Amino acid sequence: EVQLLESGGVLVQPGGSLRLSCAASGFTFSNFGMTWVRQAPGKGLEWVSGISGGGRDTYFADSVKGRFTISRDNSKNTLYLQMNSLKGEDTAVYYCVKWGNIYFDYWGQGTLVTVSS
Amino acid sequence: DIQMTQSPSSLSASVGDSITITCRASLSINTFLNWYQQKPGKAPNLLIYAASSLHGGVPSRFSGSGSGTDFTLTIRTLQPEDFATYYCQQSSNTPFTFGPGTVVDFR
Amino acid sequence: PWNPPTFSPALLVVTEGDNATFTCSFSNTSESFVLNWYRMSPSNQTDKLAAFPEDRSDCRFRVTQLPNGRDFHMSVVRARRNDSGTYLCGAISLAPKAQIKESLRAELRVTER
């Protein structure tokens, strides 16, 4: 059925940059918006960013705005999160989330991003 | 920003008990609350949307109620596959904010 | 500063077995929206029948988007007598300030064949 496959989570030094990819399959990817939700180790869930589905509207949280870039490419059914100016605080498990309504239908198992020297 | 709080922080119960956990919002949202279940090492799963609507495939024992600032989740007959952490999440205003989470344990 | 969608026709009368098609036209402002199809149960309890974007997971209620970005067809497939009632469409302004702004409701009449 619906599956979201996150990729690109690797150990990165602070101040570096990394881009996350989500392989969407099982639904009309272009019709639905998407969000990234991260869970820091030992912390709760925090909403990161959101994309409109057509890509025209973008939404960001205060903690990542100016540093993270949300983008989508409906041609290959992929969701991108460009992470720049990484901090140690940003170390978290990043979940690909199916947006498009009041509610968050499906969550991928997530990709682990560790920020350390 | 809308801050979300939950109570209780932790919960110990056995199979068959009825569980009610609450979620509070700093300001009114009136329906726009979601309930999620996270099991250790796995992605969260949606249970309740619009604060009372049951997501497809979720057992009917899971139920939600409340409007405005105060909401409740109810598990009528607790089963072994329900011991997990539950988060509430408001969707009225960006940025979307989550609750601290309520841990349900086996006793 | 955001207009609700409109739901036409006012009175849709069809014979049982035929498909009855509604048209909810929504002139969106920014593409972060969702349209929902509702049927009013007893005591003004709204049931969501279908929606666009189509969830795709009852299949007799389908929502089709027209080539213009305004009109949508909500069609009941093989309408039964018990489908007669009050129907309406609603737009939810998610991201930001989620608000359900509703259309005027319409009546469906399914007659004997």
Numbering used by the authors:
A (entry chain A): 1 to 117
B (entry chain B): 1 to 107
C (entry chain E): 31 to 87, 92 to 147
Question: How is this structure described in the published paper?
Answer:
The ligand for PD-1, PD-L1, is upregulated in a broad range of tumor cells and mediates tumor immune escape through interaction with PD-1 (7). Inhibition of the PD-1/PD-L1 interaction with MAbs restores T-cell function to retain preexisting antitumor activity.
Diffractable crystals were obtained, and the structure of the cemiplimab-scFv/PD-1 complex was solved at a resolution of 3.4 Å, with Rwork and Rfree values of 0.245 and 0.285, respectively. The overall structure reveals that PD-1-ECD and cemiplimab-scFv form a 1:1 complex, and the interaction of cemiplimab with PD-1 buries a total surface area of 1,614 Å. Cemiplimab mainly binds to the BC and FG loops of PD-1 through its HCDR2, HCDR3, and LCDR3 loops. Although the E. coli-expressed PD-1-ECD proteins used in this study for crystal growing did not contain any glycan modification, the conserved conformation of the HCDR1 and HCDR2 of cemiplimab with that of camrelizumab indicates that the glycan chains of PD-1 N58 would form a similar interaction network through amino acids from HCDR1 and HCDR2 of cemiplimab.
